[PDB]
Amino acid sequence: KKISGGSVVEMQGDEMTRIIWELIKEKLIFPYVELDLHSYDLGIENRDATNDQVTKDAAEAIKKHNVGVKCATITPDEKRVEEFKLKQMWKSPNGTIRNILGGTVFREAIICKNIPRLVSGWVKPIIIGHHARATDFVVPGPGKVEITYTPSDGTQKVTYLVHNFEEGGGVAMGMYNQDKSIEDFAHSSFQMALSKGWPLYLSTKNTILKKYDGRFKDIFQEIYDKQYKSQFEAQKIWYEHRLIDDMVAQAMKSEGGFIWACKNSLGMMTSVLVCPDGKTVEAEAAHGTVTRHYRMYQKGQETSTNPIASIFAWTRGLAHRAKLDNNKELAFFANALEEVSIETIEAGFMTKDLAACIKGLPNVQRSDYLNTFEFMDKLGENLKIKLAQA
Amino acid sequence: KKISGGSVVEMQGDEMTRIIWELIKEKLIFPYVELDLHSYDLGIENRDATNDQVTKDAAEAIKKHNVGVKCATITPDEKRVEEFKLKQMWKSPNGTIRNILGGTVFREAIICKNIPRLVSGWVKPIIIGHHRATDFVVPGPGKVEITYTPSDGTQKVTYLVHNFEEGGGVAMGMYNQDKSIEDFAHSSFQMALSKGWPLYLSTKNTILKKYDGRFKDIFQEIYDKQYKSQFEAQKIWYEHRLIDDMVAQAMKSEGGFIWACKNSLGMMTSVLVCPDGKTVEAEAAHGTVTRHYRMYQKGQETSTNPIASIFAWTRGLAHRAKLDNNKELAFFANALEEVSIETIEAGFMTKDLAACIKGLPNVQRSDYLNTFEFMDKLGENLKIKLAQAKL
Numbered sequence A: 001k002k003i004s005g006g007s008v009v010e011m012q013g014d015e016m017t018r019i020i021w022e023l024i025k026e027k028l029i030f031p032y033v034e035l036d037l038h039s040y041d042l043g044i045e046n047r048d049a050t051n052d053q054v055t056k057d058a059a060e061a062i063k064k065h066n067v068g069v070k071c072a073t074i075t076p077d078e079k080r081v082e083e084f085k086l087k088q089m090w091k092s093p094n095g096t097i098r099n100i101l102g103g104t105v106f107r108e109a110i111i112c113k114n115i116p117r118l119v120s121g122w123v124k125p126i127i128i129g130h131h132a133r134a135t136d137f138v139v140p141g142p143g144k145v146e147i148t149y150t151p152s153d154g155t156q157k158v159t160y161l162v163h164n165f166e167e168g169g170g171v172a173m174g175m176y177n178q179d180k181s182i183e184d185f186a187h188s189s190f191q192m193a194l195s196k197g198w199p200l201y202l203s204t205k206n207t208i209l210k211k212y213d214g215r216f217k218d219i220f221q222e223i224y225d226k227q228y229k230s231q232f233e234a235q236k237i238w239y240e241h242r243l244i245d246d247m248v249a250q251a252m253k254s255e256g257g258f259i260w261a262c263k264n265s266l267g268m269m270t271s272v273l274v275c276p277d278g279k280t281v282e283a284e285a286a287h288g289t290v291t292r293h294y295r296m297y298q299k300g301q302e303t304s305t306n307p308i309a310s311i312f313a314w315t316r317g318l319a320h321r322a323k324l325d326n327n328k329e330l331a332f333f334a335n336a337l338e339e340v341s342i343e344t345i346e347a348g349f350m351t352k353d354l355a356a357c358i359k360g361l362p363n364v365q366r367s368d369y370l371n372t373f374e375f376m377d378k379l380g381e382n383l384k385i386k387l388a389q390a
Numbered sequence B: 001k002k003i004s005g006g007s008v009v010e011m012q013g014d015e016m017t018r019i020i021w022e023l024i025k026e027k028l029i030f031p032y033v034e035l036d037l038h039s040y041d042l043g044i045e046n047r048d049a050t051n052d053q054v055t056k057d058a059a060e061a062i063k064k065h066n067v068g069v070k071c072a073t074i075t076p077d078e079k080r081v082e083e084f085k086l087k088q089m090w091k092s093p094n095g096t097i098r099n100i101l102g103g104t105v106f107r108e109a110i111i112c113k114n115i116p117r118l119v120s121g122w123v124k125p126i127i128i129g130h131h132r133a134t135d136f137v138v139p140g141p142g143k144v145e146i147t148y149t150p151s152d153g154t155q156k157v158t159y160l161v162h163n164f165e166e167g168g169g170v171a172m173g174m175y176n177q178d179k180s181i182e183d184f185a186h187s188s189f190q191m192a193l194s195k196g197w198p199l200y201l202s203t204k205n206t207i208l209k210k211y212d213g214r215f216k217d218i219f220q221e222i223y224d225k226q227y228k229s230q231f232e233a234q235k236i237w238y239e240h241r242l243i244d245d246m247v248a249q250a251m252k253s254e255g256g257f258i259w260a261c262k263n264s265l266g267m268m269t270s271v272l273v274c275p276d277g278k279t280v281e282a283e284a285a286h287g288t289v290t291r292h293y294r295m296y297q298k299g300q301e302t303s304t305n306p307i308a309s310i311f312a313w314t315r316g317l318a319h320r321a322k323l324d325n326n327k328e329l330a331f332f333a334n335a336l337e338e339v340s341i342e343t344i345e346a347g348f349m350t351k352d353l354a355a356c357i358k359g360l361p362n363v364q365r366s367d368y369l370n371t372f373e374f375m376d377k378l379g380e381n382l383k384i385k386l387a388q389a390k391l
């Protein structure tokens, strides 16, 4: 009997990623996991036919079901509009989903011992989270541009000069940040550091943008001391604020294995939308539809597409589903599939792009790699073995 | 006889960079070039003693003479104020200089075939040029507004930034004058013509329609009016690209372009290009190398990369040669650059470069040269090159 995986929101995509995603479900997921699958077809032709309604329904389903796994999608431009005879230049599905869910996007790399890194020292992954609008206008000629704060109680009026335009003419803007979104960024970051079991670090440039960045420093520390310090110290983890330059320096000498909150190959990186509630998660590969490889596929040429980032979208999603449902069998599966993926590459079985990382593209010969299907087949074989050895 | 190099403004700096600057002058520049040298000592102690007058004069001289070659200098902080017993926390000389001359800073990397880059495909350098904010905390609920009061007495314009209801946050105001955008466009077109490379402007005009749109419009207006012809005459062009489409292009490219951005260190040069196309100031895109200097102070062996500093001299000397139609100096500036690249490419390099190839834990003493041994090697290869060129 198969593992009962529960409720998962799955989104189908476009081009090469649409092919590999089906191979993942057919060869790696479905032979072992039964899911109450909420499928949405985010393929370009379907978004056009539904007037982008499928994207909104998918976003609402992730809100309801807490777990979303997304395949890469075509973000339309003038050329895509002509190519698919699009009714409109549809907004990116990623933006629509982000806007409906909110949360912080964390980008984590998949580390392989035989695959080179930017810094050889990096043995454990570095998870980077970026913060998650503005009033811009033209200054037609000379005169003063000021920004003013007036409290609701009306007991004060502070006025700061932005600039006194003298030779005159230019541009000016006003931008803000509410306390809640700084807190949401801290909560997502603290909950991310607990789940991964690694220390969290907040980087800032509060030397220049003193007051703006200083609020981020203060809100993080207050949230830590008031609801996180206990569990961090009780797991050998910690929270520490570092300045941009002191952070980039310490990370260059580090072994990795930390959460990096930022206030400002390729088939080996994932992107995870972590909502502040710690309940909802949306996982996806941090790469596109791989158009070039799709064109080769359409011309009958052999392709060697890296499916790792897409497999890790599934494993991260399933691992979160297992955490929410206290499902040990699913938790074991998600991790076993991650181990099989790493082990296969470390054993010398990989796609062209990875062989190119090691040897160098001009020194890569057919025997140095596996094609899309050969690679998927080797993963499926290795997963059967690892799972049979229960 | 030596080459008559003409008028050059030279600024002496601090720490390890001051030591190497003297070696470049003695071993590489002075044995071949005679200059009408306008030397200013921008060492911390001298700036303190003259109450920062030396810095203001140095910038004044670059305005008059058009060519500036600068050594890295200490920007003081509380620790530096105590270390030297400074009268003030003096403002960065680079800040004082830039403010006086105006212009755009362009960062270019020196490429060696045996030294790894971000994208291995990057054979030709990528020259990046970069283009003032009032921030405060919002304690609780209330209105944040941004106003424009015309100087001609016409109606005041008020924009709501945010009405904080749940209360609490942070706010800021930014601006940009048209003259600054015009100067940014000019320096960029000037830089692209000089290198004979295409120019790209990256902006976020989809989000910042009015703000970044003024940048896109000003660059096109200037391009179409005074640069379209000259660019086409050199089989070169200028194009606006949205940030994301620009990074995707650059990563899939072989380099060899200028990038106007509206947002090892031993191998990076920083060049300040004034909008006039006549005034240029060059320096290494790195600091004084305090760490190596302390070792030198304790009589310990150092291995400091002089490339960035040598290229400050070469870019300055190439600009001087261009202004004065001085073929001999133009040839010398190129020869010094080639001898620097070729020396590294032959296996003779400093520790940081050896570490790029082999990795810091695997670096042995036999893989690199100390500061002096490297300068001696460049000196020896420079003498050979210039002798061979006589044909």
Ligand SMILES: NC(=O)c1ccc[n+]([C@@H]2O[C@H](COP(=O)([O-])OP(=O)(O)OC[C@H]3O[C@@H](n4cnc5c(N)ncnc54)[C@H](OP(=O)(O)O)[C@@H]3O)[C@@H](O)[C@H]2O)c1
Pocket: A071, A072, A073, A074, A075, A076, A094, A266, A267, A284, A285, A286, A287, A288, A289, A290, A291, A292, A293, A304, A305, A306, A307, A353, B248
């Ligand atoms: N999250 C999303 O849904 C998302 C994100 C970005 C872009 N896109 C969309 O995808 C389409 C095309 O994107 P693109 O060609 O710009 O970017 P891309 O799909 O990331 O791929 C660009 C290149 O990077 C390499 N690459 C990326 N993923 C790979 C993998 N798994 N295995 C092997 N090589 C891989 C390939 O290089 P080589 O050709 O050198 O092997 C590929 O041609 C667009 O229509 C865009 O809107 C979607």
Ligand SMILES: NC(=O)c1ccc[n+]([C@@H]2O[C@H](COP(=O)([O-])OP(=O)(O)OC[C@H]3O[C@@H](n4cnc5c(N)ncnc54)[C@H](OP(=O)(O)O)[C@@H]3O)[C@@H](O)[C@H]2O)c1
Pocket: B071, B072, B073, B074, B075, B076, B094, B265, B266, B267, B283, B284, B285, B286, B287, B288, B289, B290, B291, B292, B303, B304, B305, B306, B308, B352
């Ligand atoms: N444009 C300027 O004038 C400028 C710019 C930045 C900083 N600074 C000033 O310089 C002082 C200290 O600088 P810093 O130590 O922060 O920065 P830095 O001199 O750029 O170098 C920092 C570290 O990077 C390595 N490094 C940099 N340049 C190198 C080279 N040419 N060859 C070999 N290794 C090199 C060294 O580390 P290893 O020991 O690991 O080799 C060095 O200790 C400050 O007081 C600051 O004000 C000036």
Ligand SMILES: CC(C)(C#N)c1ccc2c(c1)N(C(=O)c1ccc([C@](C)(O)C(F)(F)F)cc1)Cc1cccnc1N2
Pocket: A107, A108, A109, A111, A117, A118, A119, A122, A124, A125, A126, A127, A128, A129, A248, A251, A256
């Ligand atoms: C895409 C990105 C930047 C995000 N979000 C990102 C997120 C996570 C990881 C990377 C990149 N990897 C890097 O090579 C890398 C590049 C640049 C920088 C910085 C910030 O630019 C620094 F250099 F300043 F540190 C930091 C890390 C791969 C990698 C490799 C090994 C272990 N972990 C990781 N993690």
Ligand SMILES: CC(C)(C#N)c1ccc2c(c1)N(C(=O)c1ccc([C@](C)(O)C(F)(F)F)cc1)Cc1cccnc1N2
Pocket: B107, B108, B109, B111, B117, B118, B119, B122, B124, B125, B126, B127, B128, B129, B247, B250, B251, B255
């Ligand atoms: C210091 C800096 C960032 C500026 N100003 C800069 C200016 C020029 C060059 C670099 C860095 N080099 C890079 O490796 C690099 C890093 C990041 C990025 C981007 C834009 O951030 C990208 F990542 F988005 F592409 C672009 C280029 C070295 C290099 C190497 C080979 C040929 N040319 C260059 N030129």
